[PDB]
Symmetry: D2
Subunit: 283 residues, 4 copies
């Protein structure tokens, strides 16, 4: 499978979206699993999930790697509400556009916030909920905030450069030797190609700070069977938020990988793929 | 499979064991997995692991449910050293007696301590290491100690009764409705049948308090791939000890079940069986 | 100072209170400090705070040891709302009755919940806020719940006896040797003298479970300078709730005593008195 | 009091120190309190503790602000052992040189490690032990390591500049507006004046990594009454290490300041001074 061969576009009309263009990558034909990416500069569906799409399609799922509004090849946008909620509406727009009745959701950090808000706003349209270091969930009990990777996400947004990109990825990833030229260049190109996305993010950040993403008080509403994953060494969203989900969501479990940063799905792809597919099939 | 049909005995001679009788239950013929039980009154191999032996044998393993010295049908004993270490020597005695070169180990609480000490003392004789709320690991950062279930373990040892047994199990188990007459009676009978085991445990407790079981300082020596499980609601060994293992063992992961007490293998048998078999095969 | 010599009554009329009788013990004449007790059977103002009233009066404060509605010598009551909120209204009733414009509040567990709700409902009527293991604050990230001491509080409410009282105090207190006959008898007598209080508590518990006391989502509203204390070995309200306050209240500090249960003010009276008086004077 | 007017030198001869020059600042004449600084580039006794020396001398203590070997005006040095232990020997050398029989110790981060090692090696020569975010204590249960401020400490050591210094202080301090030119310049000058100190630190870092400073396993030996302080927002040494001390030292308490980074003594000087003096007098 390739980015090019799986690349699709769809216009959406959900709420304050009107004929809004969403880019995604799709493969397979079984039950739908929608995978949702983080919010750093240059993030997108394909580069975040390319280590996953194949095993999941192989296991029989239809996989959709969605670009959130204001990321990668989806339309530019300035948000006045918390990103998790706006992205969730986009997911629902996408699903109605494609005649998808229920989907499983997978999401890291911002995409986790996205998945969380979707489960809350639309409980009839979700199957299983899968979270990797989901953002949004308020103050840590242990981590000073803003987290190390958050500060770097904002620095990169405001003063983009290959050098600052590398610094940021070095913090995202436990194993530094995973930071190949290819990974860097791929991020650099998404950054270079849509400079408007950066300015828009910082604007949206001002209109609705991360403090407003916090959906903790509503976790008890979630009736989705939930799989929570964390990297032990995640410098982007702190590990004790994993405990907070486990205590507050009715039917949750938590899996924490050693020697893993903010991209469990990428840094521990094989075991990640095994646990989540097993969960999707059997939980 | 039944207790009776799988029941075996073997004499061991490792260190301060001489012709010491160990009871176990065995089934299957593939790679050996030795499962090790907790230390409460009436604990034993078969009643702790009967929800596991079948799926594991079905997956191709040879499973051995071992009674630790001074439990169930294994010989009575008074220990002057920490139980985790003495039990580990017994496991090695058992393996040499049966011509087993390497085994996978599964152990909850005391059996976890057992598995930990075995991996440390005999790294050439272990494959994979599997821990469910392992005891021994020193002070909690959050839980006052002795833990709630520990106090009840000692109360039951000293004043045994069906009523105190029920109180203890009510604390061990998240879901109270799992405490059937059958479960109670089975524990009551192991208690009633070997009263010497109780007096011996309290004696051993005095000669080597739980404070001496702590092997934390040596966790870095463990080269076994490690799977750590915890119940979120474990009132016997606290959850933050799961973090301590994840940070200190080189190649570990942690899985925490919601709505689960001190017996993950029993309260969440299906998912437990799936995760550990997958881990044994693929990690 | 004695219970008898300081004993006062006042009728209150705040909201769903009409000519409601509140017992308190008062001494000193300076700035008012109102001290509020926990919710176990037999709790009351004087026996909870008798190690404190003297040093605080000596430091120049006017001290009021209040019995909450449905405790000790205050009127019996059946509550349909969360106790923290109803007690707070009682405090405001008491202050209006006595022409007190602002008070400092001190409260452990239920009394902490009380102090929290008061600061939220009436920010113009509080000076400094002092909390010792305040209840109410939702799920722990580490402690299974109900906490050990909560279960014992409910057992004692439902089957009152001197023996169960002793068991409960043994869990409340780190140092067991502090559990003198005098302490036990004093609690036994408050229990024996107002049996209606017990039945009423369990009734109120049913109408508004502890789950409804949780005021976490509103902590950011509190503008009071806040002093949080915890016993490290508190088996009643878990220690990580202390972190939750420190991160969520604007101007807070946290002090944790070693070898201390659920009554810091009693078990570590001298240092407790020194820290809080210093805080009242200088913070 | 000024740096210049309090500035003293003393040669020491303890172990692998021979006629080794130690700079300190001293004022007052009562019981000795020795204050020990952190290990970042440019750290020293006077600039770390100038907000403290006055109130402590005013309270009647003799205060000694010691420069550790290889810092500020003390002799340059390359260490092959963990810094906490070598600094402790220097403190003992200093005390024997000045005919000081017992001292109270105050130390943040590296100086905390220093104070810890001193209490362990020389229990007859310490009074009270005071720790502010002490380094050395092994892995965090929550914080990825190296901590954010550690990475910056090493960056500054290796590529010193005013700009990197500012970045580092911005991480050390909760309130950014405390980073005046004066503070920056003072650090820049200690850096510029003794470039050998930087190269030596990195060399010593290689010979004895921070991993070897960990004295956790020996905390139970400490019989000093202990006061532990932490900033809630400390990005240099993580907050849960404060819990680890509280559970492992026999007679400890913990005080955590809100809105405080790695220098509690400086960022919250007034309350810091009040708590520690009160502790020194009364605990
Ligand atoms: Na490479
Ligand atoms: Na049933
Ligand atoms: Na006594
Ligand atoms: Na300024």
């Amino acid at each position: 499978l390739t980015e090019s061969s799986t690349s699709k576009f769809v216009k959406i009309n959900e709420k304050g979206f009107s004929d809004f263009n969403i880019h995604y990558n799709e493969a397979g034909n079984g039950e739908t699993v929608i995978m949702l990416h983080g919010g750093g500069p240059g993030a997108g569906g394909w580069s975040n999930y390319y280590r996953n799409v194949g095993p999941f399609v192989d296991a029989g799922y239809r996989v959709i790697l969605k670009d959130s509004p204001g990321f990668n090849k989806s339309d530019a946008v300035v948000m006045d509400e918390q990103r998790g909620l706006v992205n969730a509406r986009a997911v629902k727009g996408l699903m109605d556009a494609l005649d998808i009745d229920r989907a499983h959701l997978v999401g890291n950090a911002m995409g986790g916030a996205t998945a969380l808000n979707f489960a809350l706003e639309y409980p009839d349209r979700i199957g299983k909920l899968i979270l990797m270091g989901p953002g949004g969930l308020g103050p840590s009990m242990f981590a000073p905030m803003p987290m190390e990777g958050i500060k770097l996400l904002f620095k990169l947004y405001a003063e983009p450069s290959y050098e600052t990109l590398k610094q940021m990825l070095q913090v995202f990833l436990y194993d530094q030797s995973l930071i190949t030229e290819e990974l860097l260049q791929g991020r650099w190109e998404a950054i270079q190609r849509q400079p408007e996305h950066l300015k828009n993010f910082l604007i949206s950040a001002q209109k609705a700070p991360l403090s407003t993403w916090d959906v903790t008080a509503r976790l008890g509403e979630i009736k989705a069977k939930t799989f929570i994953t964390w990297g032990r060494d995640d410098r982007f969203v702190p590990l004790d938020h994993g405990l907070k989900l486990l205590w507050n969501i009715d039917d949750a479990r938590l899996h924490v990988f050693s020697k893993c940063g903010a991209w469990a799905q990428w840094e521990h792809a094989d075991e990640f793929n095994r646990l989540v597919i097993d969960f999707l099939r059997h939980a």
